[PDB]
Symmetry: D3
Subunit: 150 residues, 6 copies
């Protein structure tokens, strides 16, 4: 359905490097609709809950550390196959290996500072969305451009 939603977040480096507008603009141009948007400073709780799947990973330390060292602009986009498309537009985990045209490919160089993050599946999305947004912080009335869908 055209109501699939994904969770995306501009990490501290992204926000600090002034890439918030640029990134949002890409998804707006793609046709996806913004249903949730806000800036905050992740709490160590939220951080570990979010990256829960890596708690036993060597990098989990600095990750949670960094992810809370400054503001993060979290957002939710809605659209047909947005979860898979958003990832594609982001690139791969290593910015250096990301193709030109993708977000990481155009702006990053270090795996630790890769500008943005986003849900890797509809499952992970729903979870991460609920985890970061309160029900009333998300639109319900989503009306996209009529020139978008058939």
């Amino acid at each position: 359905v055209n109501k699939e939603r994904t969770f995306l977040a501009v990490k501290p480096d992204g926000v600090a490097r002034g890439l918030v507008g640029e990134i949002i603009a890409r998804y707006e141009k793609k046709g996806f609709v913004l249903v949730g948007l806000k800036q905050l400073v992740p709490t160590k709780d939220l951080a570990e809950s979010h990256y829960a799947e890596h708690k036993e990973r060597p990098f989990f330390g600095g990750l949670v550390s960094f992810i809370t060292s400054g503001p993060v602009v979290a957002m939710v986009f809605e659209g047909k196959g947005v979860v898979a498309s958003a990832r594609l537009m982001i690139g791969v985990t290593n910015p250096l290996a990301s193709a030109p045209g993708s977000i990481r490919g155009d702006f990053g160089v270090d795996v630790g500072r890769n500008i943005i993050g986003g849900s890797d599946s509809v499952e992970s999305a729903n979870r991460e969305i609920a985890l970061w947004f309160k029900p009333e912080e998300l639109l319900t009335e989503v009306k996209p451009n009529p020139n978008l869908y058939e």
Copy 2:
């Protein structure tokens, strides 16, 4: 001081036309820092409180009406003389009379649908900011690029 803050809001038409990223990007490029950011649907209360100065104005009707017909992404930018600069970057009330290069000048044509709004004075700002954001929704730790100020 370099801690001046202004209130800016992408009106429904702006948000609907997909200009959120583009607009934010301009202020980020200018050097101003994002201290507050969120999307919501203005309530008739907030609407009238915001445009309180025009309650006796002929257009006050449709204004408050429209301003709540859909999502609005409100935001707060901080920086040296941001209130006056932000207005300058916006243009004048009538998009048609706004110079190329300014936001309204580049995207609008109707006074009723002029993409964005912003505080016209430090006074109006403080008021509008407090009016739209809750104290904890705004950063306190604002560290701009060091290449920005002397």
Copy 3:
């Protein structure tokens, strides 16, 4: 009713310098609608008819000469106060004196090679439009973004 239409034309230098897309994109971004569009090579007739008002002027020679030395993409845009707005976005006759942000201001340096031309009044428009386009080469069903006007 606000369907005012204007005639704009990317002169040979503009077309040759590959600025067609760029220029169209600006007016599209502004909100104006494209009702007529085509590329051709002006005939000495059309040329003199077009610049009829300068037939006794000392430059009329090279003008008509140049304006037909290569392709020209003529177009018609429709929208509220488009004639005046389009001129504003173009700049002034001398590119060097045109402000940054305007078309001539951003791309030209010589009065003889100023990238684009456009009707300077609703009168001149109607005349120039009819002069360059055949009635069936122009849309009649013009439906703009429902977010542009109120």
Copy 4:
């Protein structure tokens, strides 16, 4: 030889979403030359003739339907291997599966509304060109930037 030509067309959704300039600009930047350009509203004849190869596929219905629901800006570009290159710049049939950087990859989400179409072979080109343009609507004197070729 650098005389190869291809047929490209901004479909109604593309035109309606205001992507005409943007798209033309990409091909101009690539180095290809514009030999034919015009806006029109496809007739059911032209439509079926164009998509003749799909008269049986379960989508031929809505396709021809849509392709004529509004203006389309058809165009012809000339240059070394333009047919294959143009397709590459477009992406694949499904916008969601198209890579960032390509036209569909950057602007579309639905297979039915994929912004643009273009000849898939020199054969299909010649046919589609002749089908859409009258001989005198195409330049013959094509002089590209000298810096493009060896």
Copy 5:
């Protein structure tokens, strides 16, 4: 004559904020030709010689100080009325008072950190050029796009 040349320099903050390409790109788009280009770290000598006219003003101190705190990419552009046009594209001394569309207007906020500097007269140019470049570091064979001039 279209031989006029001006001296422009991206100051340390500009270079540090990664605006070198962006700035050069503007002048290239305008039609001016690059005759000299290089990156270096101004010496206190060069610095004071350059800003010789301000040796008394209360800011000459930090100015010379800053202008040598890091790399600077100096450059020379050639073209009809380039000195006046370049300044226009830069804006005014105070970035906050510079119009959107101009370099300072779009990227700076502090008079002390105004991204770029440029000769304010043909006189000042010749002097500053000779002062920063060695005769063989400047082209002599300057051939601009033929579409720029009449």
Copy 6:
């Protein structure tokens, strides 16, 4: 330690087509730091020394010929894995086969006129760097954005 440096050069066609700013801007946006930058006209010596590996190749003739037919802006960028990343951003030898988003993919069409060149290995880099720049023409104090690496 990640100060890997690479040598890149905007060939005559690139410089002539006015793509210098655009190209530099991409690498600046990527996060790489500019350590060396200058414009010159390659001497037949430098040319053959540079393309030494192709002296017996059938194209070596016109190559060296062209590479010295006009100005070239040589530059050195420093950053984590810059040599491999820079190549990726450039595309493949044939512009037509280069993906959208890469430099050649977006601007070139002919293998002979492919806008830019860059070291294909750390080995080739060191060699080409030393070959094109004098030790004091390269920075030593390289301080990148503190947000780029962890």
